Ligand binder design. Structure first.
Ligand SMILES: C[S@@+](CC[C@H](N)C(=O)[O-])C[C@H]1O[C@@H](n2cnc3c(N)ncnc32)[C@H](O)[C@@H]1O
Ligand SMILES: Nc1ncnc2c1ncn2[C@@H]1O[C@H](COP(=O)(O)O)[C@@H](O)[C@H]1O
Ligand SMILES: [Mg+2]
Ligand SMILES: [Mg+2]
Ligand SMILES: [Mg+2]
Ligand SMILES: [Mg+2]
Lengths: 388, 376
């Protein structure tokens, strides 16, 4: 009559997320000067190490080393006690230019269709459902918020012993018949901390200040299991502790496994990379379908060929909850959304330095003004055009 | 009455796959000397560059640079004209390396998925299965000189049409294939050879129709390639490595990780569980999710979905799985004989769906016991 489902998130101090944030800070710095820049910025962080590699073609003049160090400092890695310290980190720049063989497919006036072609082949999924106020699956939505809360309390000093690296995991119970959340089964929360605080003090504060204020009280019961720093002390973390790379948190970045993923990473990529722009568009489409009341769950897949503007495929699944057929939904989507690469960029105003905030705590489910793919401004037109 | 679904794969020369293969070649070299080693070997490749970083605990003595160069050589990067070559690139070793029970706790939290279905002989989804085979065929004809103008880097993408009622594949709608090439061959000659000698020998003829669209090297040129054209990193092909989008993913990479790491061992176990449930005729579609907490042995969650195809309830299946499989981290290692150098081959053309002798998670040796224990 019920089943379990689990998602996780990590803080901005997790080493993979450090790499994502460095990649998107560099992207933002470039786009602030050159909105049309071609950016494919990959980052690897390790002990004392920040390698910047990939392909960038831009008129922007950005001090990549300074931007990387300032990003690492803003995350919290700015003191000798943490091991990994921006001031004591080697930043090495290895960027190439964008390959001209790729550029001639993407550039307008040079495509097989002379339109802006997709930056790559690939497949992308979007998803929305009615489980949370921002139309996200429950477990990833609240896992992100646990990690945001950890960072909030650290950065304003209310829990001054918190350190940057942390992880959270939620196992939730669903009703097999209704698909509705019944209760929270397990909360895992691990946080880095100053060595002077005891594990007992830490657990009390994590419960009072992080777990209880974030999760819905009605879903925490006598059966809920709390696993706080379950292997004990967590003093060293970040890239002193383990290696981080761009694009190694793609499930955290999206839907926490509540929907399939096409494989493409987001951070460090300008919007001509459909890995980013089309995944954002798919979230926008699915969210507006659910907000229009046309389905209570909606999943979309698209795909592209490098150097081709029209998607090679589109498919929509409402899991039996759609008020109209999925064929009619695809027709509505194609009428109200331009999923060609240039059409997406125009639809979502993507040639702007709006990406740094997306690189931790999830790309989806936060109704921040930067995140145009979270607007539900097409829902009314979809509902009307469906005949509802 | 119909819907579309798309998956992709990449060749062993794709820069992300180069990184995966270097990571797992180093893992194998370590495991051959020290089966109990802890390995978390990450690789980044770019123009003239192979960075090796991560954490290793072992008694093995491995020449990591030589292993990396040998792996790059085997893949086919043997000229600096390509911007990346085995003899000439810089290899830099940054590992944090140190010298150095069924209820041992997991080494991390995390979630993992497995999947199986009846669409292909090895119980894989159609689109990923044949996307892999397209890329294996590209590499085969390059290496044996049948198409000597091929270069190592390549990608393929299949869009398939499914019947909305029966769920069966009806036809192939679009084949995308991009392959790096010697500048001397025209696009017209390249396109014809890819279609006639790579694509058509691999895909089922009855699924290729006059409506099938072939998009070959659609930018018009693919001479620059490899890590120069596109930086590669370990763990950036996790959907190619698994089910091509036909099932969700927990997020963790496989390559460079020793089998104590549940990101890899539990995903392999979930494939093993799902494939045996299908092989036993208990379902035609089966998806499983597990998760772990750091320091805890038994998974924090397990769930199974047969998408209405199951012959017993999913509750009954979960009970069967707990009785017939040991999903504790050390129990998986024993179940699948994982403390051996068996991983280098997994790092290109998919971890699932090939019944190689190394791939113990592809054995259906529990199907009969599950079919009997289910009462069927
Ligand atoms: C298109 S690149 C990703 C974007 C790239 N980093 C950039 O700077 O725009 C990803 C993969 O596409 C393939 N690729 C590279 N050049 C290509 C070309 N000219 N045509 C088709 N595929 C290409 C290679 O497999 C490469 O690893
Ligand atoms: N003592 C610890 N307890 C819980 N989580 C940790 C601890 N140390 C590190 N982590 C987290 O776990 C991630 C994966 O690496 P590992 O520390 O090996 O599990 C790290 O990047 C940290 O986010
Ligand atoms: Mg990681
Ligand atoms: Mg991709
Ligand atoms: Mg890549
Ligand atoms: Mg992991």
């Amino acid at each position: 009559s019920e089943y379990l489902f689990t998602s996780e998130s990590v803080s901005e101090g997790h080493p993979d997320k450090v790499a994502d944030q460095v990649s998107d800070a560099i992207l933002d710095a470039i786009l602030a000067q050159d909105p049309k820049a071609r950016v494919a910025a990959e980052t690897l962080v390790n002990t004392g190490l920040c390698v910047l590699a990939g392909e960038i073609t831009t008129t922007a003049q950005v001090d990549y080393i300074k931007v990387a160090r300032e990003t690492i400092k803003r995350i919290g890695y700015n003191s000798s006690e943490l091991g990994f310290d921006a001031n004591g980190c080697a930043v090495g720049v290895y960027y190439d230019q964008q390959s001209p063989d790729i550029a001639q497919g993407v550039n307008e006036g040079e495509g097989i269709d002379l339109n802006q072609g997709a930056g790559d082949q690939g497949l992308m999924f979007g998803y929305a459902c009615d489980e949370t106020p921002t139309l996200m699956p429950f477990a990833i939505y609240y896992s992100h918020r646990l990690m945001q809360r950890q960072s909030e309390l650290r950065k304003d000093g209310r829990l001054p012993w918190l350190r940057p690296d942390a992880k959270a995991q939620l196992t939730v119970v669903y009703d097999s018949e209704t698909g509705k959340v019944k209760r929270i089964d397990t909360v895992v929360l691990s946080t880095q901390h100053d060595p002077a605080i005891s594990q007992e003090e830490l657990s009390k504060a994590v419960i009072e200040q992080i777990i209880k204020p974030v999760l819905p009280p009605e879903l925490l019961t006598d059966e809920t299991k709390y696993l706080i720093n379950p292997t004990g002390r967590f003093v060293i973390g970040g890239p002193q502790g383990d290696c981080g790379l761009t694009g190694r948190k793609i499930i955290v970045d999206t839907y926490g496994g509540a929907a399939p993923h096409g494989g493409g990473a987001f951070s460090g990529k300008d919007p001509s990379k459909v890995d980013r722009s089309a995944a954002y568009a798919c979230r926008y489409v699915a969210k507006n379908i659910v907000a229009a009341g046309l389905a209570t769950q909606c999943q979309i897949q698209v795909s592209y060929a490098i150097g081709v503007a029209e998607p090679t495929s589109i498919s929509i699944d409402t899991f039996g909850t759609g008020k109209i057929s999925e064929e009619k939904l695809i027709a509505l989507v194609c009428e109200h959304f331009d999923l060609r690469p240039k059409g997406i960029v125009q639809m979502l105003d993507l040639l702007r330095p709006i990406y740094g905030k997306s690189a931790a705590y999830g790309h989806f489910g936060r109704e921040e003004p930067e995140f145009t793919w979270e607007r539900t401004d097409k829902a009314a037109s979809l509902k009307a055009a469906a005949g509802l």
